[PDB]
Amino acid sequence: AVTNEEIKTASKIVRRVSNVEAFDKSGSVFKGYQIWTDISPTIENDPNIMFVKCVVQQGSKKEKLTVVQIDPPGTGTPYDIDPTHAWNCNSQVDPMSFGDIGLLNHTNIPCVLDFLKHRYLKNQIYTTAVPLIVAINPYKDLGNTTNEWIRRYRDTADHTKLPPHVFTCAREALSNLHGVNKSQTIIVSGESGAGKTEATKQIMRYFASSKSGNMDLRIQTAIMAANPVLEAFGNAKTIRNNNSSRFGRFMQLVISHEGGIRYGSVVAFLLEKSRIITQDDNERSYHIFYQFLKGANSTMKSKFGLKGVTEYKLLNPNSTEVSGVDDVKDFEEVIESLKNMELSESDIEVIFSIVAGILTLGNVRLIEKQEAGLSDAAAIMDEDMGVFNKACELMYLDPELIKREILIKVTVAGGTKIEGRWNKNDAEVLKSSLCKAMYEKLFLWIIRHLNSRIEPEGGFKTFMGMLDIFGFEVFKNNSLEQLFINITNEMLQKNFVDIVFERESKLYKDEGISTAELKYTSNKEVINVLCEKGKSVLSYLEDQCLAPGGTDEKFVSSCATNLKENNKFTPAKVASNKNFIIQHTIGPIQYCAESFLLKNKDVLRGDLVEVIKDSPNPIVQQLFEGQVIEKGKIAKGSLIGSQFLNQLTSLMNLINSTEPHFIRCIKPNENKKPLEWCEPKILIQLHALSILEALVLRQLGYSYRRTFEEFLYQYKFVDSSVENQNKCVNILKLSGLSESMYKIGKSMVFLKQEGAKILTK
Numbered sequence: 001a002v003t004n005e006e007i008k009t010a011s012k013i014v015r016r017v018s019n020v021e022a023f024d025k026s027g028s029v030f031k032g033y034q035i036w037t038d039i040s041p042t043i044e045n046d047p048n049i050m051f052v053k054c055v056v057q058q059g060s061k062k063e064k065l066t067v068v069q070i071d072p073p074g075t076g077t078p079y080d081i082d083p084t085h086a087w088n089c090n091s092q093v094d095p096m097s098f099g100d101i102g103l104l105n106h107t108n109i110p111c112v113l114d115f116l117k118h119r120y121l122k123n124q125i126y127t128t129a130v131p132l133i134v135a136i137n138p139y140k141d142l143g144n145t146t147n148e149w150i151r152r153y154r155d156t157a158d159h160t161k162l163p164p165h166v167f168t169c170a171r172e173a174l175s176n177l178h179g180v181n182k183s184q185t186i187i188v189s190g191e192s193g194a195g196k197t198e199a200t201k202q203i204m205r206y207f208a209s210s211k212s213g214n215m216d217l218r219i220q221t222a223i224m225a226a227n228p229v230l231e232a233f234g235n236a237k238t239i240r241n242n243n244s245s246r247f248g249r250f251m252q253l254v255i256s257h258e259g260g261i262r263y264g265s266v267v268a269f270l271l272e273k274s275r276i277i278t279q280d281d282n283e284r285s286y287h288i289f290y291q292f293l294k295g296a297n298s299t300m301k302s303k304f305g306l307k308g309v310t311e312y313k314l315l316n317p318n319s320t321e322v323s324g325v326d327d328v329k330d331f332e333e334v335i336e337s338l339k340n341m342e343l344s345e346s347d348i349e350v351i352f353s354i355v356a357g358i359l360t361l362g363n364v365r366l367i368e369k370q371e372a373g374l375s376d377a378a379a380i381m382d383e384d385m386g387v388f389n390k391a392c393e394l395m396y397l398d399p400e401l402i403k404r405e406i407l408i409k410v411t412v413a414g415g416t417k418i419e420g421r422w423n424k425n426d427a428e429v430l431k432s433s434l435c436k437a438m439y440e441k442l443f444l445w446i447i448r449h450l451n452s453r454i455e456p457e458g459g460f461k462t463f464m465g466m467l468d469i470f471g472f473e474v475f476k477n478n479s480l481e482q483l484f485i486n487i488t489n490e491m492l493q494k495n496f497v498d499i500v501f502e503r504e505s506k507l508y509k510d511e512g513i514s515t516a517e518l519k520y521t522s523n524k525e526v527i528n529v530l531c532e533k534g535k536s537v538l539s540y541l542e543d544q545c546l547a548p549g550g551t552d553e554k555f556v557s558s559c560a561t562n563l564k565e566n567n568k569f570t571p572a573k574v575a576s577n578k579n580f581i582i583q584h585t586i587g588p589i590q591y592c593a594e595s596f597l598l599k600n601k602d603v604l605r606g607d608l609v610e611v612i613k614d615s616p617n618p619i620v621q622q623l624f625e626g627q628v629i630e631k632g633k634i635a636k637g638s639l640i641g642s643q644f645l646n647q648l649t650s651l652m653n654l655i656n657s658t659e660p661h662f663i664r665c666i667k668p669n670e671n672k673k674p675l676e677w678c679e680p681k682i683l684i685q686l687h688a689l690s691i692l693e694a695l696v697l698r699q700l701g702y703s704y705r706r707t708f709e710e711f712l713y714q715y716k717f718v719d720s721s722v723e724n725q726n727k728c729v730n731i732l733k734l735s736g737l738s739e740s741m742y743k744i745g746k747s748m749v750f751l752k753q754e755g756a757k758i759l760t761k
């Protein structure tokens with residue numbers, strides 16, 4: 001389904017640069033000119049398609065062109081349109097012959113759509129946008145990922161012979177890393193479900209493909225067997241995709257030339273704790289629960305006291321079975337994938353005992369009481385007490401101590417303590433927060449246990465970076481988690497434009513700036529409205545959290561007044577008290593605030609942490625390990641969002657250092673169906689992944705760039721301080737290039753996409 005909002009957002013992107021020169025010099029009009037048009041009942045009746053192909057009929061003027069619809073099959077009726085609505089077509093070409101869009105004569109919106117389409121439906125998804133690699137999602141296994149296809153890339157000697165691929169950007173990066181001994185990073189970008197995880201899995205498998213049979217299994221073995229476990233605990237079924245990464249994945253990898261992983265680092269960030277507690281309908285919790293509850297052996301089941309996937313209140317009993325997902329099979333895989341991380345039969349037994357714990361604690365009914373002369377007072381339900389006692393046993397903590405930290409408010413004046421009781425609402429809020437913590441920190445501990453065996457003896461010098469972020473998400477409900485997810489993405493988009501469209505624009509201005517006709521990404525306007533310390537959505541949520549009386553509406557009002565003067569922040573038209581639109585790269589995204597404060601405050605702290613700290617089980621002790629208690633008033637550092645900004649900014653800054661290798665995934669249709677083309681949903685991504693500009697300004701702009709000394713070296717016969725500047729201009733005028741093809745800069749020689757190719761004989 002394509003929203004009329006997705007239709008609007010895509011219709012804005014529609015731009016007409018080049019003119020339709022479709023008339024024979026004399027007259028009679030050019031004989032059968034293929035063009036594109038926004039006008040046709042075939043565009044009106046269909047939302048999936050935006051343009052039809054037409055043949056320019058003989059006897060039309062440059063005011064109204066009589067055109068007949070060729071593709072899609074037209075009623076054969078010639079209709080008249082203004083040249084304003086006619087784009088130049090890449091008349092008679094074979095989209096399969098060349099694996100780079102750069103070779104296209106015209107690279108207008110309709111032409112890139114038809115080019116990527118005539119490939120996607122032909123089952124060639126990957127194309128080079130230069131630098132970028134556009135990798136569409138065909139939803140079906142193509143088999144162009146296999147060890148056979150891996151070998152074919154790594155071992156094949158010539159780099160030009162190699163067609164566009166994920167493996168193309170894997171060798172491209174691995175070669176530079178070993179050759180120029182500079183640490184390189186692979187950026188995976190697109191929608192939440194466009195192909196990030198898949199490409200990341202593929203490129204990992206590629207670096208795990210060894211030529212030599214010498215290297216130690218241990219490190220590589222554990223790293224690859226981490227991916228299935230990481231997904232069990234870190235991925236869940238969504239309305240957008242049935243395996244959505246609810247954590248941002250980052251890797252640092254030491255891979256020796258002969259395709260072997262010597263060392264690695266696994267860092268996951270920002271887990272979705274609101275997954276474990278509740279799930280949207282049609283949506284689900286983290287795979288692990290389901291896999292466990294199903295494929296658990298007779299004994300585990302009885303020992304833990306496991307029930308059905310329906311019988312656990314934390315897990316939605318309607319959305320339990322995933323369309324085309326066999327949870328028992330994946331569980332079996334997840335169990336071996338754990339052993340293959342140096343986790344013993346006991347270590348596993350514990351992981352699942354805690355998991356069984358979280359579930360069992362989430363079935364405990366808390367109730368209201370008139371108790372201790374407090375009323376509204378927290379008290380565990382009489383019957384559900386047995387549940388709670390095993391629930392704690394399973395987590396390996398004292399039940400009556402967890403019972404004491406929930407149900408009892410503990411305050412301090414001076415060096416002296418004051419008792420008091422927790423209320424039903426707040427006790428339930430705390431009971432939930434215990435589960436959230438246990439889960440988040442167990443996953444984090446498994447990541448820590450993996451890193452303790454895989455990380456380098458010393459540290460990381462030159463490594464291979466890989467980023468499996470959570471892509472842009474749009475629904476009906478858009479919470480703080482959904483806001484964080486879209487903030488993360490916006491950073492990975494400015495990271496890109498600063499490297500791809502800014503270093504360029506600077507170098508032109510530093511030498512010979514040809515066009516003021518360049519980049520289209522005003523990501524700075526939206527990255528500031530969201531992160532800029534003091535004045536931003538996050539900074540007015542940060543301040544509001546540490547405020548005494550801080551309401552969700554109080555935070556909304558501060559943005560609706562302070563950030564008003566900006567176009568990127570738009571307040572809601574209806575229910576303006578709660579909702580607000582943030583005009584993203586992918587377009588207008590609206591957030592219903594509500595709980596925003598408590599969600600940013602959703603982090604376990606206090607004397608409660610200390611209970612888990614001195615647990616009998618060591619894994620449970622280690623579960624928190626490095627934790628600053630404070631037991632009271634919250635800090636700026638302890639805030640969920642405020643920690644995330646620090647986390648993203650720090651990690652992103654390491655990436656800006658390493659060599660950027662961009663992979664751009666496109667989701668062709670929401671329908672989760674192979675070989676289905678929805679032009680508007682795609683067009684939005686062509687704009688956001690900046691693909692339709694990263695070719696407009698690469699082909700229109702100068703692509704060579706070499707200093708006088710570099711240029712004059714290839715023409716050996718010549719050799720000089722200001723004279724060698726004029727020496728280069730000669731070689732060019734002699735070779736045959738027009739004064740438009742080349743440009744002479746303050747220190748270098750710029751040569752166009754087409755020009756630079758001439759001098760290569």
Ligand SMILES: Nc1ncnc2c1ncn2[C@@H]1O[C@H](COP(=O)(O)OP(=O)(O)O)[C@@H](O)[C@H]1O
Pocket residue numbers: 125136137138139140141142190191192193194195196197198199241243244245469471665
């Ligand atoms: N190149 C591909 N070939 C086949 N299926 C793919 C491909 N890329 C993605 N998919 C499918 O699309 C699903 C959603 O993509 P996913 O791996 O979760 O990436 P992301 O991190 O963007 O969500 C995958 O689980 C897989 O079924």
Ligand code: VO4
Pocket residue numbers: 191192193194196197241243244245246469470471
């Ligand atoms: O769907 V994602 O794995 O990109 O979050």
Ligand SMILES: [Mg+2]
Pocket residue numbers: 196197235243244245246468469
């Ligand atoms: Mg993922």
